[PDB]
Amino acid sequence: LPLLPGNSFNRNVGKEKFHKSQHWGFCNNVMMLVSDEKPGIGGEPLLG
Amino acid sequence: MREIVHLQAGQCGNQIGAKFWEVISDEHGIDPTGTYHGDSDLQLERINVYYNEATGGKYVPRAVLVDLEPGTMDSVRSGPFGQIFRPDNFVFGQSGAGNNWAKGHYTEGAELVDSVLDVVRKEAESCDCLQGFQLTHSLGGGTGSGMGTLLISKIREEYPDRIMNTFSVVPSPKVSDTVVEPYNATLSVHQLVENTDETYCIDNEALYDICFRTLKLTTPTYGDLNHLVSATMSGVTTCLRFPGQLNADLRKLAVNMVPFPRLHFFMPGFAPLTSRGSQQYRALTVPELTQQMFDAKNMMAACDPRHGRYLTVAAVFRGRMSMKEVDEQMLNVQNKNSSYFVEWIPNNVKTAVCDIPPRGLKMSATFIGNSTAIQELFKRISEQFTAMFRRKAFLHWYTGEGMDEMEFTEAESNMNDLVSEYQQYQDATAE
Amino acid sequence: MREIVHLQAGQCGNQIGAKFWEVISDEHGIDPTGTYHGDSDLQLERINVYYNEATGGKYVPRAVLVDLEPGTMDSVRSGPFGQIFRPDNFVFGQSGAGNNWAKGHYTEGAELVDSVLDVVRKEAESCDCLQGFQLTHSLGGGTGSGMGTLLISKIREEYPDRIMNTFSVVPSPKVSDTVVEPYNATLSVHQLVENTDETYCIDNEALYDICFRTLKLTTPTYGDLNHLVSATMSGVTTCLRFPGQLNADLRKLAVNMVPFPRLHFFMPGFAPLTSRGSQQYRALTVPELTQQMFDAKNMMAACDPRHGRYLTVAAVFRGRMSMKEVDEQMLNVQNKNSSYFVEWIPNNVKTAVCDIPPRGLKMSATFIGNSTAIQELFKRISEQFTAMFRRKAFLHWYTGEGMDEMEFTEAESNMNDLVSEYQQYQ
Amino acid sequence: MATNYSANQYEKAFSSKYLQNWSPTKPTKESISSHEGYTQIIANDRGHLLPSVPRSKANPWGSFMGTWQMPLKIPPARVTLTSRTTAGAASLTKWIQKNPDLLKASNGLCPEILGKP
Amino acid sequence: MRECISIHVGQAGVQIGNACWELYCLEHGIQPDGQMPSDGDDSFNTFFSETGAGKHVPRAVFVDLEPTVIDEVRTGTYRQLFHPEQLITGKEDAANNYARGHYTIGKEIIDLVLDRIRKLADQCTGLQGFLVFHSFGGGTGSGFTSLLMERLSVDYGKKSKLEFSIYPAPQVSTAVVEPYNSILTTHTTLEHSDCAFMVDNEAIYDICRRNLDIERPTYTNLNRLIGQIVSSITASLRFDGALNVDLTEFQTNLVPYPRIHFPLATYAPVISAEKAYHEQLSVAEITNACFEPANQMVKCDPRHGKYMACCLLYRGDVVPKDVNAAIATIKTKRTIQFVDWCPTGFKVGINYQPPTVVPGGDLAKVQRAVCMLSNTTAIAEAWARLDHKFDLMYAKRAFVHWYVGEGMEEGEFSEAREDMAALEKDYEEVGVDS
Amino acid sequence: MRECISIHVGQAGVQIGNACWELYCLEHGIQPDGQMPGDDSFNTFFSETGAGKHVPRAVFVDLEPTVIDEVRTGTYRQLFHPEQLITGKEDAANNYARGHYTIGKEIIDLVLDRIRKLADQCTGLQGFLVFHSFGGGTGSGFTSLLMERLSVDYGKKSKLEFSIYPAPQVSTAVVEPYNSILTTHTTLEHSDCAFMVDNEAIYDICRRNLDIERPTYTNLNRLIGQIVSSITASLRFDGALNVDLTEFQTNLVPYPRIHFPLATYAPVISAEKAYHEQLSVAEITNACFEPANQMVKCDPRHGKYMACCLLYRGDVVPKDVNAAIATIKTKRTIQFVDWCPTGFKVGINYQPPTVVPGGDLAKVQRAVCMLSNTTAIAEAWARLDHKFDLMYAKRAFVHWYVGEGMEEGEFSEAREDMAALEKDYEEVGVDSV
Ligand SMILES: Nc1nc2c(ncn2[C@@H]2O[C@H](COP(=O)(O)OP(=O)(O)OP(=O)(O)O)[C@@H](O)[C@H]2O)c(=O)[nH]1
Ligand SMILES: Nc1nc2c(ncn2[C@@H]2O[C@H](COP(=O)(O)OP(=O)(O)OP(=O)(O)O)[C@@H](O)[C@H]2O)c(=O)[nH]1
Ligand SMILES: Nc1nc2c(ncn2[C@@H]2O[C@H](COP(=O)(O)OP(=O)(O)O)[C@@H](O)[C@H]2O)c(=O)[nH]1
Ligand SMILES: Nc1nc2c(ncn2[C@@H]2O[C@H](COP(=O)(O)OP(=O)(O)O)[C@@H](O)[C@H]2O)c(=O)[nH]1
Ligand SMILES: [Mg+2]
Ligand SMILES: [Mg+2]
C-alpha cells in the first residue's frame, strides 16, 4: 500500500481518549514551543 | 535551482499542507525523522526545491504554517509527520478569528503579518533562485480568507516578478459550512482577481463525489480529500524536480493558459483514480487516462464544463509513454467536440511529459482547465451576497470593526465586471 | 475493428442477455473468471467484436444492463457467469415502471437516460470502427417497451449511419401475461417502424411449441427458452468473428432483406435441434438442415408463412460443407413452391457459409425470413388495441402521466397503415 | 435559504428521492440570473423594511397548517378526468377549488389535473 | 432496497399483524428475540432492519385506540422483537363510531402515527408502498383509517397504499352500526386509495369448515390464512422467481376506472394433511380451484358478474408451460365470462420458494401454491345489499345522534349515500357489453 | 490555553455547576480530591498548583448559605477553592429590586475581584459562561449588574448566557413576569448570545424518552451539563473541523436585538431502547429538527429558521453529515427566512460523550447538539408580555419593587422596550416583493 489516493485507513477506528495537549504557547511574551516533553494525543509518546 | 516556498493559511490550509508534505516526503523517500532512506539516485538530484539541508544530513521543508488559534497547530504537531517542520516556522497568535473576514484582515490579522513576512523573507533569501510561492487556504473562513489575502498583497508587492499559486477551497453549493460564506468569498475573490497569478478552485462537493463514484470508499474522512488535493499539487510541480521528454514548469503553464490578466481561475482533475473493486476490469492506456481526464464528472469543482467553452487546457503526464499517442489523443478530444472549445484559438491544449511515475503507479496525468463555465461559481456567490446584503443581514459584525459599507459594493461590482468579461469571451466569435 | 455494443433493457432483456453472454463465452473459451482457456488459436482472432481487453489477459463484455429496479440484476449477478460484467455498467433506478408505458417513457425513464448515455458514449467511442448496436427487450412491459424505445430514439439521433438491431419479444395471442399488454405493444411498434434497421419478432408461444414437439422436454424452464433465442443471436453475427467460404455481416443481410424501408420485421429459426430419443434415428446432411430450417413448426414467431408470401429469405450456415449442395437446395425449394414466393423478385434466398460450427456439433444454420404473413402479428394487436380504446379502458394510467390522447390515435394510424403496406405485396 | 442551488453536474446525486425523502420537494433553481452593478440597500439597521419598499401580503411567520386547521374533507392528490362525465368531473374541480388555503400552505397538497372529460 | 411499510390499524389489524409477523420471522429464520442464530444474507431488508449489533426490527406500525389488544403483544412471546414506539396505543376506544374515530378521538394520535411513519419511510432506501390492514365495521379501523389515508396522501404524494380490508359479511355481523361505518368509510376512501383487497369472515369460515375439516375455527386460523395470502403477495419481492411482479404492477393491472379499485382475494390449495396424502397437487388443479365460487374468500358468487381483470401468483415447483396450458383451459370454458373490452384479461407471476409450514398450524406441507386477485362486477350486488341496509336503518334516522353529537353534521350521511348510489350506476355502466 | 471562565449565579446556576463539574472531573480523570491518579487538556478548566492540585476556573455566587454549604460539606469539598464560593447573608426574596439595588451591591466588589484574579492567571481567555435563571430574584437582579460591570471592565470578550426561561404553563413564582421583563430589558443590550432552556420541555423529554415518570432537578442538571460539554468539547479535544467560542457567536446573531437561540440534544434515550434503535448520523440530526425533541416548549413549524449550528461528537464521517443535511434541506416542513441563503454551521469532534455513573443516559458512539435561532420565539415573548401587562394593569406587586429603590417608570419603559422587540421580530419576518 504505497500511499495512493484511497489507499489509507482510519487510525481512529477503535480508539478512545482523543485528547490534545498545549504544545504551542506563550512564555515571557515570546512565541515558543513550551515543553518539548508532552504526549501526542491520548497519552501516547510523540514518536521518540 | 527553482525553490518553491509553501504558505499554509488557516486550519484548512494547515491540514492540507500537513497531508501534502507527507505525500511528497513519501515521494522523495524522507522518513519522519528527517533523514534519507531511498533507493534511486534520482530522488536526491532535485531535492532543494522543497527541502533545506541542515547539519547532520537532515532535510527540512520550506514551508511556513500561519494561523491564529493554535488548536489545529497542536493537532498538526501531534500527527505522523509533525516533527519535520522547524519550530520557528509555526506562526500563531493567541486569539481566534471567529469566522470574521474583518477580524482576519484588519483587527487581529494586522499584528501578525510582520512576523509572517519576517519568516517568509528569511526562507526566501536562502534560495539560490526562487521560482515562486505556493499557498493553501479556504474562502469560507476567517484566517485563510482574512489574513491569506493580506499575505498575498504583502508578499506580491515585496516580490513583484515572481509567481503566486493559490489552492483555494471555494464555498460549497450545498454544504454551507459557514453562515457568512458569501461575505467572506466575495471579499476574498475581489482581492484574488487583482493579486493572484494562478488560482485553483478546489471544491468539497466534487471531492466527495469523486471519492464515492470513482474511488468507491465507504467512510471518507478528510485524510482522503486532503490526499486527492495533495496528489494534484504533486502532479502540478513534477517536471520541476523530475526529468522527462517535454518539460513544463509553473511559469510555462501560466503563460500557456492565461490569455488575459483577469482570467486565472482553473478547474483541476487527476487521472488514474481507480476503484477499489474494479481494477482488473480496466486497462492502463493513454486513451483511458485521457477519457478520465476529460470526463465532466472528474472535475474538482462544482461547475459543469458543458455549460461553457474551454478557453485553454493543460495536461501533465507522468511515466514512460509514447508522444504520438498523447498528441493524437489531445487532437482527437479537441476535434470531436467543437462546441466546448473557443473557436478563435487553435491548439487549446498544452502537453507536458515527465519520466518518473508516482510510487506504486505506472502512468499518471493531471488536468488543469481554464474554462468559461467557472462564471457559475461567481454568479451564485454574487447572488447570495446580494440576497444577504439587501437586508443588512450579519453586517454589524463587519461594520463595527472599521469596515465601511462601500467595500462590499466595490467587491460586488468587481465580481459582476468579472462575470461580464467571462460572458463576453464566451459569446465572442471567430469573425 | 467491427464492434457490437449490446443493450439490455427490462427483466426480459436481462434474462435473455445473461444467457447470451454465457453462450459466446463458451464459443471463445472464456471461463467464469474471465480469462481464456481454449484449444484453438483461431478463437482469439476476432474477439474484439464482443469483448474488451483488460489487464492480465482478462476479457470483459461490451454490454450495458439497463433496468428500473435491481430485482432482476441481483439474480443475474448471483449466477455462474455473473462476474464478467463491469460493475460500472449496471444502471438502475429505485422505482419500477409497473408495466406502464407512460412511466417508463416520460416519467420514470426520463431520469435514467442521463446515466445510460454516459455509459453508451463511453463504450461506443472506445471502438475502432463501430459496426452497430443491439437491443434485447419485450414489447409487453414497462422497462423494455417504455425506456427501451426511449434509448433507440436517442442513440439514433447521435449515431444515424449505423446498424440498429432489436430482438423484441412481441406479445403472444393466448398467453397474455399482462392486462395492459396491447397498449404497450401498439405504442412501441409505432416507435420501432421509424427508428430501427432490422427487427426480429420472437414469441414465447413459439418457444413453447419447439420445446414440446421438437425437443420433447418435460419441464421446459426459461433457461432453455433463453438458450433458443441466444443460439440465434450468435448465429447472425458468426461471419463477423469466424472465417468462411462466403461470409455475410449484419449490414450485408439487411441490404439483401429489406426492399422498402418500412418492411423490416423478420422471423427467426435455428436448425439442428433434435430430441434426445431421436438422436440416433437421424442422418446429418445439408438437406436435413434445409428441411428443418424451412419448417413451419420451427419458426420462433407465432406467424405461419403458409398464409403469406416470402419476400426475402436468408440462411447463415456453419461448418465445413460443399458450396454446390448449399446452392442446390435453395434453388430446389424455390422451383417447387411457386406460390409462397413473390414473382417480381427472382432468387429470394441469400446464402452465407461459415467454417467453425458450435462445439460438439457438426453443422448448423440460422434462418431469417421477411414474410408478408407478419401482418398476422400486427392485425391481432390492432384489433385488441381498438377493442379497449373505444371503451377507454385503462387510459387514466396513461393520460394521467401527461400523454395526449391523439398519440393513441397516431399509433393506430401508423400501425394500421403498416398492415396495408404488407397487403399490397401479397 | 429561500433558494436551493443546483450542483450542475452533481444534481442527480442530490435529488429528493435519492436522499431517501419520499415527500414532495422544494424547487431547485436550475438557472441563475446575472446582475450588473452594486445593490441598493432596502432595509434598516434593525432589519426593518424601508417605507418606500413594497411588501408581500402573506403571513410573516409561515403557512403551516396543523391537524386541527386542515379541512375536514381533504381533496385527493391524483386527479385524472379521463373517463368521467362532463358534470361529474366538474364537481371534482370545484372540490379542489373550494379550499385555496390547503393549496397555498407550506405543507400544501397540490393536486395536478390531467385530461379532459 | 425493495422495502415496504406495514400499518396495522384496529384490533383486527393487530391480530392479523401478529399472525403475519410470526410467519415472516419463521420464513427468514429470525428468533423471537430478534437475532438470527449463527448465519451474508440481506433478503430480509424488505421487512426487517439491521441494527449494528445484529438485531432485526420490523417495519410495521401497530395502531390502536384501546390498550388491551397491544398489551398482549407487549407482554407476549414477541415482546423483544418489536420496537417500543412502534406499538402505539390509545386511551379510550371509538366504540363503533365513525365520528368518534374521525373527528374527536382519531384527530389526537394521528400526528404521532404520522411521525413514526415518517421515521420508517426515511429509514427505507427504496419504497414500494404501504400496506394498511383494517376492518370496515370497526370504529377505529374505519374512522381513524379514513383520515390516516387523507393525511397520508397529503404527506406522501402518489405512493402505493394497498388495503387489506375485512368486508362486512352479508349475514354474520358482530356490530349493528356496521352499514353506517362502511358507507362513511368507503365514500371517503374512494378517492384516497389505490387498491383494496377484501376478505370477509363468513367465506373463510365456510372454507375452514369444508376444506380444512376444522369443526370449530377461531380467529387464529383465519389470521393464519390472511398471513399466507400476504406472504404470497410479497414473495416476489423477497425471493427470486422466473418472472415476478412488483407492488405497482397489480395496482395498474386491476384498476380499469377511477372509481373501481375493489378486487377479491382467493388462495389455493387450502387442504388438510389427511387429504394431501391422497390428492396429487399439479399446476392445473390449483388454478382450476381458484376459479370455483365455493373457494372464493368473499361471500359473493362471480357467476352473476363478469371478470374485469385477474392476477395470478404461483409459488413453488411450477413450470410456465403448464401455467400457459391451464390458463388456456380456463379461457376456453363458458361458465367463466370476461367483459368484451378486456381481451387480455390475465397477469401472471411465478416464484420459486414454496410456502413455509408454521408448527401448530393447520395447512399441509405443499410443493406448489397459487393466489389470485380478481376484479368482478359481482360486487355490485354486495353494494346493493349494503345500501339496502343503510337506507333501511336511515329512513327512521336511527343511531344518527351518536354521530351528530360527536363531531359530524347530518348532511354527510345523505352525501355518502348519494356517492354510493352513483357507484352502483358506475358498476352497471361498466358491466354492459357494447 | 484555549480556556474559559464559568460564572454560576443563583441556586439554579450553582446546581448546574455541581452537575457540570462532576462531569468535567469524570472526563479529565480528576478525582474528587483534585489530583490525577503528561496530558494537559484540563488546562481549559482546571489550573495546576505547585502541590499537584487542580482547581476549577469557576465562580459560584449566591445570596444565601443553604445551597453553597452543601458544596462546602459534600463530596467535592476538597476540589473547589475556598474563595471561589461567594455567599451573601440574606437572599433576594424573589425581588429584582432587592437583587439589583440593595443586596447586590454588597458582594459585587468581591465577585469582580475574584473574576479579575482568575483572569490574571488566564493566559488567553476565550470568554465567560454565565449560568442563571430569569425567574429568580438573585439570578435576575444580581446577574443584570454583573453583566453590566463585566461589559464595563472587559470590553469585547464573549459573554455567553445559559438561561432558564419561564415555562409556558408550569411556573413556581408569582412575580416571574416582572423579573423576566426587567432582566431582559438590560441583558438585551449587555449580552452577546443567550442559549435558553426551560423546565417543562426537559420534563417532557425525560418523561417520553427516558421513561422516567418522576424526574427531579438532578436529571435536568445532567442534561444541561451534557450540552455545555458538547459546546466546549471542540476546544478540549481534537476533531476534523472544530468550532471556537466566537464562531457560533458570529454565525447565530444576525441583529443586535436578536440573540436568543434554542438548544437541542440528540440522541437522548435509555439503555433499554439503545438495544433496539440504530443511531446513525442521519437519524440523530433528523431527531434534532423534531419539535418533540426541542428543549424550549415551542413549535418551530410556526416560525422560520434564522440560523443553525450543529455540533457532532464521536464516530462521525463528513459525508454522512452532508447527506443528512441535504435530506433536511429538501423538506417542505422546514422553512427558512428569505435573506439567509446559507444557514448552517457544522462542527465535528472525535471523542464520544462520557457516561456518568448513577446517571440515566446510556452512552453512545455519536451525538449531536443543535443551536437554532428561529422566529418562533415571538410566541414566548408575546405570551410573557400578556402576563406582565395583565398583572400590571392594576398595579399588583408594585410596592415591593418601588420601596426597594427603583422608580416606577422603569416598568413602563421596559414594557415599551419589549413592545419594540415584538415589532423587531415581526418586521424581520416580513418578506419583500
Ligand atoms: N378476519 C378477522 N376479522 C376480525 C378479527 N378481529 C376482529 N375482526 C372483525 O372486526 C370487526 C369489529 O371491529 P374490531 O376490529 O374488532 O374493532 P376496531 O376496528 O378496533 O373498532 P373499535 O372496537 O370501535 O375500536 C368484527 O366485525 C370482526 O368481523 C380477526 O382477528 N380476523
Ligand atoms: N432547570 C433547573 N432550574 C432550576 C434549578 N434550580 C432552580 N431552578 C429555577 O430557579 C427558579 C427559582 O429561582 P432560584 O434559582 O431557585 O433562586 P434565585 O435565582 O437565587 O432567586 P432567590 O431565591 O430569590 O435568591 C425556579 O423557577 C426554577 O425554575 C435546577 O436545578 N434546574
Ligand atoms: N478539503 C478540506 N477542507 C477543509 C478541511 N478542514 C476544513 N475544511 C473546509 O474549510 C471550510 C471552513 O474554513 P475555516 O476552517 O473556517 O477556515 P479558517 O477560519 O481560516 O480556519 C469548510 O467549508 C471546510 O469544508 C480539510 O482538512 N480538508
Ligand atoms: N423469452 C423470454 N420471455 C420472457 C422472459 N421473462 C419474461 N418474459 C416475457 O416478458 C413478458 C413481460 O415482460 P416484462 O416483465 O413486463 O418486461 P419489463 O417490464 O421490461 O421488465 C411476459 O409476457 C413474459 O412471457 C425470458 O426469460 N425469456
Ligand atoms: Mg376496538
Ligand atoms: Mg436561594
Author numbering:
A (entry chain X): 3 to 50
B (entry chain KH): 1 to 431
C (entry chain LH): 1 to 426
D (entry chain m): 1 to 117
E (entry chain LG): 1 to 39, 45 to 439
F (entry chain KG): 1 to 37, 45 to 440
Manuscript text:
Cilia are cell-surface organelles with cytoskeletons formed by different microtubule types. These microtubules are decorated inside and out by proteins that alter microtubule stability and elasticity and allow cilia to beat. Here, we used cryo-EM to reveal the structures of two distinct types of human ciliary microtubule: the doublet microtubules of respiratory tract cilia and the distal singlet microtubules of the sperm tail. Among the microtubule-binding proteins identified is SPACA9, which we show is capable of forming both spirals and striations within human ciliary microtubules.
In total, we collected 16,933 useable micrographs, from which we determined a 3.6-Å resolution structure of the 48-nm internal repeat of the DMT. Focused refinements improved the resolution further so that all protofilaments are resolved to between 3.1 and 3.5 Å. In total, we unambiguously identified 33 MIPs. However, we also identified six additional MIPs: C11orf1, CFAP77, C5orf49, FAM166C, FAM183A, and SPACA9. Despite the overall conservation of the MIP repertoire, the tektin-3 homodimer that forms the apex of a pentagonal arrangement of tektin filaments within the A tubule lumen of bovine DMTs is missing in the human DMT. CFAP77 forms a connection between the A and B tubules on the inside of the outer junction, CFAP68 binds at the microtubule seam, and CFAP90 and FAM183A bind to adjacent protofilaments of the B tubule. SPACA9, the single unique component of human respiratory DMTs relative to bovine DMTs, binds in an arc of three proteins to protofilaments B02-B05. This trimeric arc locates at the intradimer interface between α- and β-tubulin and repeats with 8-nm longitudinal periodicity, generating a highly distinctive striation pattern. The density for SPACA9 between protofilaments B04 and B05 is less well resolved than the two preceding copies, suggesting flexibility or substoichiometric binding. The footprint of SPACA9 on the human respiratory DMT involves both α- and β-tubulins of one protofilament and an α-tubulin of the adjacent protofilament with an interface area of ∼1,000 Å2.
